[PDB]
Design a binder for this molecule. Structure first.
Ligand code: HEM
Ligand code: I6Y
Length: 411
């Protein structure tokens, strides 16, 4: 059929778009007119990739199919982040292969089994009561300030405390853990231009290796002991593997949940009836509708290891496919009224945590718990909050971020 009605050279990974808005109409145009579409990229404008473009994947069933066929659609070959600075050196993409998100089977399989021996429902539930306390204190301190930046005073801290609690980081070390975690989220936005994620990653690995050595001597009620203790087959994270796991957790556990919280509250501010309902019933289905609405990871990619036909389109060996979770999470064929914010939506088969498959978010239930606990505290302590001014968005080609959002907590 006809080509989609998009500006010439439009690139769905263009960070300049996301600094200002989400390209919702443009994704909807692809879903209607070209649901798998070649996103050409001019020379040097590939965000670190120099292959002329990628396939934009906009439908939820195609996202699931790619996520399920990890034997064809590789994470390792080019990593899963689809956009860096245009001049990033290839070696700096490939160094990301040392974290489990960017590996393939069998290396991925071994690492995930280890990381899931201690990253369990029991381990996550053991954090509930401390995170609930922490959420209530966060919302109370914010309410006591009267007004301020919702991102920094409400959204930022609880995800970081969840990472610290899961790893057993002593309170005296949490400040520098949080600092490293914030540094690692990138430097593509002018506000963050001076951050050095490479150096912070190196500092975190050093910290984590020391922790691994200490905790081997003195086991404790954290997941760490389960990770570095050999099983029957002698399987365990090496000290440097634990280091790369901590890097993985420090980055993955921070900005995505933060941005869920900020955008969830933005949604409630635009849909006051859903906010009234939330405050009365406190439904935990809210968390998934908030992750669907927020889609904190706009997109992750894969690389085809062989020719593969996907929904009538021929994907060729070596081509990238980019899974636009932001489009799939609003797919009219899967969701009833996707552009309605409905905190009781159930079932809610969103792909905010990725498609079912080998790389499905191991932190999904921790994130959901974090979200439910912070929104209960917000409802308890600042039920009448109202925004002062517009959110400031983050310049990124794949993360959907809110840097700042001024709010009057007393309303
Ligand atoms: C709302 C919050 C979050 C969102 C939107 C989110 C999103 C995602 C997505 C889309 C993936 C799929 C990776 C792929 O298929 O290439 C993923 C994987 C992953 N997430 Fe999350 N995530 C969240 C929170 C967390 C938290 C809190 C943690 C850890 C405490 C975490 C750790 C991980 C890890 C380690 C993986 C990689 C798993 C593997 O490669 O086997 N995430 N996440
Ligand atoms: C899964 C994954 C993530 C996730 C993974 C990586 C992530 C972030 C945020 C930043 N990075 C890394 C940034 N890249 C490019 C810029 N240079 C440094 C390296 C989140 C979250 C949840 N679940």
């Amino acid at each position: 059929g006809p080509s989609p009605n998009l500006p010439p050279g439009f690139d769905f990974t263009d960070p300049a778009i996301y600094a200002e808005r989400l390209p919702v109409a443009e994704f909807a145009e692809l879903r209607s007119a070209a649901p798998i579409w070649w996103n050409g990229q001019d020379p040097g404008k590939g965000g670190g990739f120099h292959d002329g473009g990628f396939w934009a994947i906009t439908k939820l069933n195609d996202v699931k199919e790619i996520s399920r066929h990890s034997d064809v659609f590789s994470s390792y070959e080019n990593g899963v982040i689809p956009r860096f600075k245009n001049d990033i050196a290839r070696e700096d993409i490939e160094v990301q292969r040392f974290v489990m998100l960017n590996m393939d089977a069998p290396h991925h399989t071994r690492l995930r089994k280890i990381i899931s021996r201690g990253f369990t429902p029991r381990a996550v539930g053991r954090l509930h009561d401390e995170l609930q306390e922490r959420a209530q204190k966060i919302a109370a301190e914010a309410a006591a300030a009267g007004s301020g930046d919702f991102v920094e005073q409400v959204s930022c801290e609880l995800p970081l405390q969840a990472i610290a609690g899961l790893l057993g980081v002593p309170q005296e070390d949490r400040g520098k853990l949080f600092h490293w975690s914030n540094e690692m989220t990138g430097n593509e936005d002018p506000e963050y231009a001076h951050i050095d994620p490479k150096a912070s990653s190196a500092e975190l690995i050093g910290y984590a290796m020391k922790m691994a050595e200490e905790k081997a001597k003195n086991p404790a009620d954290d997941i760490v002991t389960q990770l570095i203790q050999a099983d029957i087959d002698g399987e365990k994270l090496s000290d440097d593997e634990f280091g790369f796991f901590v890097v993985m957790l420090a980055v993955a556990g921070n900005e995505t949940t933060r941005n869920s919280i900020t955008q969830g509250m933005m949604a409630f501010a635009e849909h006051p009836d859903q906010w009234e309902l939330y405050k009365k019933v406190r439904p935990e289905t809210a968390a998934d509708e908030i992750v669907r609405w927020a889609t904190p990871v706009t997109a992750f990619q894969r690389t085809a290891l062989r020719d593969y036909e996907l929904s009538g389109v021929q994907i060729k060996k070596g081509q990238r496919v980019v899974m636009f979770y932001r489009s799939a999470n609003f797919d009219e064929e899967v969701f009833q009224d996707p552009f309605t914010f409905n905190i009781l939506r159930n079932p809610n088969p969103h792909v905010g945590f990725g498609g079912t498959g080998a790389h499905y978010c191991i932190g999904a239930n921790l994130a959901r718990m974090t979200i439910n606990l912070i929104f209960n505290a917000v409802a308890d302590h600042m039920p009448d909050l109202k925004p002062i001014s517009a959110p400031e968005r983050l310049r990124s080609g794949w993360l959907n971020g809110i840097k700042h959002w001024q709010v009057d907590y007393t309303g």
